[PDB]
Every structure is written in C-alpha cells, then in structure tokens.
Amino acid sequence: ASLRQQVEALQGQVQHLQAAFSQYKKVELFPNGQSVGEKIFKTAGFVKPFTEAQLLCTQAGGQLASPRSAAENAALQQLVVAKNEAAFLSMTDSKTEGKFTYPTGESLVYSNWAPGEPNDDGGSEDCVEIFTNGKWNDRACGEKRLVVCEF
Amino acid sequence: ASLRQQVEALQGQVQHLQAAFSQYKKVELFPNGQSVGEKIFKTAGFVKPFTEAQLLCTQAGGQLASPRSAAENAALQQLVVAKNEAAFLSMTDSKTEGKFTYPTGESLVYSNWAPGEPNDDGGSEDCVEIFTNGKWNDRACGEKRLVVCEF
Amino acid sequence: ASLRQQVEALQGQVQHLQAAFSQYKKVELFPNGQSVGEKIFKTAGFVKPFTEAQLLCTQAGGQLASPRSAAENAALQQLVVAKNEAAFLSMTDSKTEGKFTYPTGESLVYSNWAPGEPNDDGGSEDCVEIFTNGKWNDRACGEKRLVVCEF
Ligand SMILES: OC[C@H]1O[C@H](O[C@H]2[C@H](O)[C@@H](O)[C@@H](O[C@H]3[C@H](O)[C@@H](O)[C@H](O)O[C@@H]3CO)O[C@@H]2CO)[C@H](O)[C@@H](O)[C@@H]1O
Ligand SMILES: OC[C@H]1O[C@H](O[C@H]2[C@H](O)[C@@H](O)[C@@H](O[C@H]3[C@H](O)[C@@H](O)[C@H](O)O[C@@H]3CO)O[C@@H]2CO)[C@H](O)[C@@H](O)[C@@H]1O
Ligand SMILES: OC[C@H]1O[C@H](O[C@H]2[C@H](O)[C@@H](O)[C@@H](O[C@H]3[C@H](O)[C@@H](O)[C@H](O)O[C@@H]3CO)O[C@@H]2CO)[C@H](O)[C@@H](O)[C@@H]1O
Ligand SMILES: [Ca+2]
Ligand SMILES: [Ca+2]
Ligand SMILES: [Ca+2]
Ligand SMILES: [Ca+2]
Ligand SMILES: [Ca+2]
Ligand SMILES: [Ca+2]
Ligand SMILES: [Ca+2]
Ligand SMILES: [Ca+2]
Ligand SMILES: [Ca+2]
Numbered sequence: 340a341s342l343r344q345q346v347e348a349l350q351g352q353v354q355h356l357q358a359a360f361s362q363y364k365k366v367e368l369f370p371n372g373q374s375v376g377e378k379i380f381k382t383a384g385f386v387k388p389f390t391e392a393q394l395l396c397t398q399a400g401g402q403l404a405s406p407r408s409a410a411e412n413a414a415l416q417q418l419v420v421a422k423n424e425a426a427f428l429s430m431t432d433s434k435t436e437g438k439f440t441y442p443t444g445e446s447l448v449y450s451n452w453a454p455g456e457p458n459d460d461g462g463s464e465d466c467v468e469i470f471t472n473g474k475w476n477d478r479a480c481g482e483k484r485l486v487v488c489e490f
Numbered sequence: 491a492s493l494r495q496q497v498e499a500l501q502g503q504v505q506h507l508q509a510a511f512s513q514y515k516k517v518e519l520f521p522n523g524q525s526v527g528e529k530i531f532k533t534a535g536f537v538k539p540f541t542e543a544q545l546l547c548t549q550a551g552g553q554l555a556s557p558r559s560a561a562e563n564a565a566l567q568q569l570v571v572a573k574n575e576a577a578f579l580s581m582t583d584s585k586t587e588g589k590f591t592y593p594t595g596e597s598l599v600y601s602n603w604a605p606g607e608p609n610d611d612g613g614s615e616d617c618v619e620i621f622t623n624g625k626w627n628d629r630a631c632g633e634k635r636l637v638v639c640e641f
Numbered sequence: 642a643s644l645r646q647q648v649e650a651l652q653g654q655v656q657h658l659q660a661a662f663s664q665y666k667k668v669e670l671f672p673n674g675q676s677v678g679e680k681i682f683k684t685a686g687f688v689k690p691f692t693e694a695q696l697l698c699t700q701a702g703g704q705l706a707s708p709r710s711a712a713e714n715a716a717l718q719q720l721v722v723a724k725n726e727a728a729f730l731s732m733t734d735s736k737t738e739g740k741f742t743y744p745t746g747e748s749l750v751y752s753n754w755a756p757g758e759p760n761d762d763g764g765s766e767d768c769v770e771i772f773t774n775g776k777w778n779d780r781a782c783g784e785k786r787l788v789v790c791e792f
Binding site for chain 2: 342346349352353356359362363365366367368369370
Binding site: 493496497500503504507510511513514516517518519520521 | 642644645648651652655658659662665666669670674681683685686697698701702703788790792
C-alpha cells in the first residue's frame, strides 16, 4: 500500500523533471545545435583540419557530422549556413581511393554529392566537406573546415 | 514484494537525476543564460538586425527577449552588461506607429523607457533596444544589436 | 495489484529521461566543458582579472577551477590547451603569504607547481595560473586570465 503511494510520488517528480528538461533542451541547442530525429549536431564554432576535428568529436564522446538522410543533411546545412562556413563530414576514402566509408568502415547509405564529385582533385582529396548549399565535395583533409560533431 | 526493491531502485534513479539535472542547469546557463521565474534568457553572443534576430529565436523554439517585469528586465540586463552590447527586444510598433506590441499582438504590460523615449527619431524607429543601463530606446530595426532569446 | 504495471511504466519514463539527459550532457560539454568524476569544468571562453573571474563563477552557482588531483588537473588542462590561454585557479595565498588555500580557507591537498614556483615574484603574486603544459605558477591577481568555473 505504501508502495502505491511511493509510486505516485515518483510520478510527480518525474513529470517535473520531464517538463523542466524539455525547456533546457531548447535553451542548450541555441544557437549552435540542431536536433533531427534522435540525432543532435553541434558545431564548435571554429575551423580545424580533419584530423584535429575528428579527435575533438571523438574525445567529446561523439563523432564528426555524418548525415545519413536528406533530413539530417538539411539539419546540418542549417548550421553551416548560420556560420557561413563549410564543414567536414566524418567520411573518407583514405583506406581505398574512391570508396568512401564512415569511421566504422561501412559504406555510405546516403550522399549528396555535387555534380561530378567526388573527383579526387589533384589526386589528393580524401575528406568530404558540405557546402552552404548542402552539396558534398571531396576535399584535401589538410584544409580547415567548420567543426560539427554529432551526438 | 520484489516490487519493493524495484521501487527503491527507481527512487534512487530519480534522486540521482534530480541532482544531476540541477548541476547541469548551472553549467548550461554559464555564461550566456539567465533564469528568472519560469523564463530563461540566452544570448547568441553576437549581433544581428531585427528581422534576422527574430528569425533565429523563432526557429530555435523561442522568441526575442520580452521582459514583462522589473525582475525579467534586470535578468536580461545582466546579459547585456556582461557582453557590453545593447540588445533588441521583441516588441515593435511597426504596424501602428506609437503603439508598441509583442510578437503575439497584445499591447505592452510593462515598459522601462529611457527619459524622452520612445521618440521615433527620424520618423523611423520601430524596434526596441535595451541599454546596458537597463533602459529601453526605440531604434531603427535595421541596426545590428545583441541577439538574446527567451525560452 | 496493477502497481506492478505502474512501476513498469515509470521504469520506462525514467530510463527514457536517463538516455536523453546523457545525450544532452555530452552535447553541453562540447567544446567548452570537461567532466571528471562528479565535477564539471566549463570555460567562459574569455579572460578576466581574478576578482572579476571569481565573481562570475560564484554568481553562476559554482567557483573558480580548483583541481584537487592529477585527474582533475589534466581535465582542466584540456580546456586551457583548447583555448591556448592560461587560466586562473581559485586558490590564493592572500591571507598568509606562502600558504595557498581554497576559497573555504583549507590548505591545498594537491599542487602542480612548475619548477621554481611558487616564488611570489616581485613581492606580489598571490593568485595561481595553470599553463598550457598543466603546471602552476603564482601570478599577480590583477592579470587577466581564462575564466574556468567548476560545478
Ligand atoms: O579546391 C578544390 C575544389 O575546387 C573546385 O571547387 C570549387 C567549385 O567548383 C566552385 O563553384 C565553388 O563551389 C561553391 C558552389 O558553387 C556553391 O554552390 C556552394 O554554396 O559553395 C561552394 C564552395 O565555395 O568553390 C569550390 C572550391 O571551394 C572543384 O569543383 C572541387 O571538386 C575541388 O575539390
Ligand atoms: O541613434 C538614434 C538614437 O540617438 C539618441 O540616443 C543616444 C543617447 O542620447 C546617448 O546618451 C547615448 O545613450 C546611452 C545612455 O546615455 C547610457 O546611459 C546607456 O548605458 O547607453 C546608451 C547607449 O550608448 O547613445 C544613444 C545612441 O546609441 C536618442 O536619444 C535616441 O532616442 C535615438 O533613437
Ligand atoms: O610574469 C611573472 C612571471 O615571470 C616568469 O614566468 C615566465 C616563465 O619564466 C617563461 O618560461 C614562460 O613560462 C611558460 C612555460 O615555460 C611553458 O612550459 C608553459 O606551457 O607556458 C608558460 C607561460 O607562457 O612565461 C612565463 C610568464 O608568463 C617567472 O618564472 C614566474 O615565476 C613569474 O610569475
Ligand atoms: Ca587517396
Ligand atoms: Ca580520394
Ligand atoms: Ca572535389
Ligand atoms: Ca513607424
Ligand atoms: Ca516608431
Ligand atoms: Ca529613440
Ligand atoms: Ca602576498
Ligand atoms: Ca604570494
Ligand atoms: Ca611566480
């Protein structure tokens, strides 16, 4: 009997937490975050070469932005447009030229390559950048692009 | 009766969440947010013209800062002072000159105008900025001011 | 006794909340915060003299970074390195020259002084800064250093 009362009490505490937290979710994502589905993109707000950008995301418990649908790509694009800086995606073809994969090693399930890309320009573009127009282009990993991680 | 040991686990989970959530709130608000009552003000840390600022807040799930009491205005003022950048409020008299209203449409229920304001200087001041001193002044919507949203 | 089904329900809500909270926490800390044990360090991203930095942290419900172990120091070093700006710690020897203490008055339980430090150079170094290499140096409280608070 006391348990039924203890349960109701917990119900009230949970409802409170749920409500308060929903508000802080909005506050937190402003202005550098974007929620799409169960994924959250967040930009560090600055540019870094691929290797450094990758380390920043992984050490933070996430990974570089990896849009796997038109919906996610559009969400990521909003951050890129807002910062007016193209960003690096997580995928590369460093292992096998022409074969882009996620950090897991799996093949792409979605892509939004600009016409003619990837073209491995100069024979040395193994990373991927997303333009403010939302399209993808393979680019030199040594370049510095906006750091956007996904969680 | 095993339900009793399960309730005990739940109680522990909720207390842990209450403690973690409270700590997280302080972290989030530092150093660009202010909690006042049920409202939360948060600055984007940069400036933008009115239209742009308004869009940013709306798309983020909130709206431009709309202080409705001396208490809210003081909370907002802290952010303005910290950043040393005057900010736009959500209110405007763009529809009917001389009559400032909220994004919703209702008339002002609180105001903290500087002496002599609003004066529609140049016959073209329909937006509202709040100075580091906390006072309000009607200013051209085309000017760039600190973006501060409320949630 | 559908209380067993009622407990099942809350079990699900609490776990759903635990998952969302864990995700938003990681997002929150990227890229200006660092979690170590139950402590959370977060930098404001800018510099301020000691008194102003201390006030910012206290007003935020926390205090200046106070590394109490090699683990916490390394965590704080990450933020300093990321911003490439030495930061102030909370400890000072203002009360009794030579004896550094925490805001509570307790003497240090951990230190990471650089060789030759602390030296009270010039006869007036009562604050402490942590370099990008993680070592400490007593420095004039009037200098402006990175603001990092702990919650
Ligand atoms: O530098 C190596 C890359 O060089 C070429 O890329 C050019 C595009 O050809 C050029 O049009 C422009 O791309 C912009 C695109 O037209 C625009 O719609 C979008 O919003 O932003 C893009 C980025 O500014 O500039 C890029 C170079 O930055 C080449 O096509 C590409 O394959 C090479 O990797
Ligand atoms: O530019 C159009 C506005 O021009 C006039 O505003 C001036 C004030 O007259 C001037 O004193 C100064 O206001 C500052 C105020 O005195 C100070 O206490 C506060 O902390 O900051 C204010 C902003 O710097 O500058 C403003 C212009 O920015 C005119 O009075 C106003 O109605 C016109 O809209
Ligand atoms: O200004 C008062 C301090 O002056 C002296 O400090 C110097 C060091 O002597 C100098 O080597 C350099 O320290 C750097 C340290 O060698 C390096 O490993 C670390 O990553 O960064 C340090 C800071 O750039 O600069 C400091 C001054 O900033 C004096 O030794 C010290 O006791 C005085 O307080
Ligand atoms: Ca290659
Ligand atoms: Ca390639
Ligand atoms: Ca290319
Ligand atoms: Ca008008
Ligand atoms: Ca007007
Ligand atoms: Ca005016
Ligand atoms: Ca002294
Ligand atoms: Ca001293
Ligand atoms: Ca010294």
